[model samples]
Target: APVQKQFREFHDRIKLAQYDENQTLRDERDAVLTAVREGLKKVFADRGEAAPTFTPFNQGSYAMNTGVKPLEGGEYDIDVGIILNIAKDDHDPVEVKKWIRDALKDYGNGAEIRRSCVTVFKPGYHVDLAVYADPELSGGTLCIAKGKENSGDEHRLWQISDPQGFQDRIASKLSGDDAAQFRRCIRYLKRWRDFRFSAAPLGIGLTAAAYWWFQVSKGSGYDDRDALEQFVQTMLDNFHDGSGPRLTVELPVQPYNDVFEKMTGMQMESFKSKLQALLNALKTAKSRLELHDACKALADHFGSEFPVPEK
Candidate 1:
């Protein structure tokens, strides 16, 4: 479970890698891409079928950004979405799921495809595969079939509640000069999220390493960048430094159930009450400014309440 959570931060870091001016370590990205595509193709062919015309769409941190990534070693778990060219509106998601299941089933390598989740692990990391039937691929929207559906993944498809409203809540917290400070924090978290999903332990560490270092090195007295960065750095520095280098740990701020509760509208009063409470929290504390402050206060007030290690 810790590994799963930490890897999402790995995904965030990989996304940050995209922004880095340093290009020499670029080989790492290519290595992941090559291994992933080749591995997927091999699994398909092991069953005697031709590799379905595979192309990397959203192949980079964008891929991780979209909630998919390689886990460890040569192993990976990504949303290997096939482009089913049907009328965008005409495509049957259930039927499309069947086609994919059948295709994977024929592979006969102990890999099983459920309605939305596929399990594949031959030599590499045993992956819990998710398929999104992306008709309008450009919209950054798709019917995400798997993931902890109770989490944010399912809410994207059937928006009984407005999902963007959560983001809007985050944005409204900081305006004008305050906006830039929060944006920097968002950028840091966003990048950390990218690295997390990538599933690389060292990559995750170094990203956290650089992030915290930036926090202290760049923190000038009044600069909010330093404050946010220091908080993050302190979080990671304490955790990893005390424990030494280990990949197994949950991310600092993963909205496992919170994200889901924020997205759905409860049709009933009793259930809606709990969901409404969460929604109100999102409404009131929408931005990183609110979240960061909330996080710090909790940490400071409850000492070890938030799980950052000591200096």
Candidate 2:
């Protein structure tokens, strides 16, 4: 019971709700988005080209409501996807990426062209604008414009992607309180990743794992702690496939690929061990009789934010 309270406290300490709480963060994000829109229109006018109609949608952890407050002096990362009405084949991917980069050049702390998006940095946060264009041929899928400012031809292309599909996949996993607890379980693991490894696995990979493997229970017997440990232990149980170590967390939508694809063998090993450590700590915490003692076990691995209740 006390552990559940502590888990909630940990969540309150680190969970970042973009739509509800964190009004200042949300406002700042809106300001950045507005600046980019204005900048894009101005840039298009200067070049004697009509501003193409487009729509912006939320992506990443922000859209799925799995976002967490950055720890260890890290900055918050939010992702926004922009879909231009223009056909993908009609414009150069690199050029469109440059346009988005130019739009944010004079605003925020800084703005730069990443491979898959244009990132605009603010005080303690940054927004990644992932640009995509339509097929316009009616039945074709959307493609994201991927490249950097000086990227070569091979480095630039229209990458098949669907933000809506991805978001829908995450939303389809759970609903209401079940979904909220699912998201909270993710933030806890994400925070653990922060404490455990600086060069750890991707957050989306962990999110994907949770989306596929996490089991939500009913009634009053479970809390965030149960939700968390169950996810971890469950994840560990699924890490292999009747062979040598392999952990695959695939995206549920277009351009289907493993989110954990980037992790090397060594890194994957490290990640698994760290996950085991987290699982072990949670088990020990549950076994401890004293509230303070239980929290101490978690705090050891989850850092001070997880808390140790008063003795």
Candidate 3:
């Protein structure tokens, strides 16, 4: 019971650190969106085409409301999705991908073409522009450019993706009090990842995994603390209890994708090891008889961001 009180205190501090303190960050987010819109418009104008009907939306932690502050002084990486009304047959996948990058070439260091999106770096933070084409407009399934090299190929072909639909699926899985608790737990997990891991098993992968866990464990937990504990134990038991050399966190959306598929074999091993360590640390915290000792143990697992309550 003492540990419960300490947990609540630490979690409250985590929330404060995780969210923006003022409107400055939100204002910056709006500027980034505007830049994205203008850049896309210029790209169309330069190509001698009318401005196509496109819808811009937020994705990742920002949209899910599970965002955590960057480690130390780093800035937030906001993800933006652009769904266009262009047909798939109108242009080559590589060309469309390159065009998006070209559009943002004048922004700071230019756009870095990544595996699934074009990333534009700014002064305070960066924006990842993931381009998707709608089925009704494109007369086909939604697709995103794969900007990385594949075996025997310069860059892999465009792949089908449903950012909006996928996000909706995640949203539909939880509602009301459960949704709020799930988002909080996700932010905590994301904060843990930022403090503990470097590469491999990104926040998105962890988020998708946590969503799946929440879906299955719907009736098990009654509060945020209970939900968090259930999530941690379930994660450890299902993925890291001497299960395998690699752990795959599958995305629940179409193409039945694996969010962790990009993680290398070594990265996967490192992820499992870190996860095991986290489980051990949490177990130690739960077993401590004193509040100070329990909070200290928790702080060890979650880094200095986790406040240790006074005795």
- Among these predictions, the greatest lDDT belongs to 2
Each model's TM-score, in the order given?
0.33, 0.89, 0.84
Roughly what TM-score does model 2 have, to 2 decimal places? 0.89
lDDT of 3 by residue, 169-247 (tens): 7678778976766777777777778788755347778788787786322343444445566676676566643344666
Q: Judge candidate 2 against the unseen true structure and give its global Cα lDDT, from 0 to 1.
A: 0.79
Clash count for candidate 2 is 0
lDDT of 1 by residue, 159-227 (tens): 112223323443454465444444444344433333233223323233233323333222222343234
Task: List per-prediction Cα lDDT, in the order shown.
Answer: 0.35, 0.79, 0.68
Worst 10 residues of 1 by lDDT: 255-264
Task: Report the candidate with higher lDDT, 1 versus 2.
Answer: 2
RMSD of every candidate to native, in Å, equals 14.3, 2.6, 3.7
Model 2, 1-311: lDDT tens digits are 24887888899998888654557656766777787788888888999988765677777787778888888688888777888777787788988877777777778555888777888876677888888886573238789888776778998989888678877888888888888788888888888888777753468888878878888854664576666778888877778743446688778787888878777777777778888888888888878889888999899888889888788
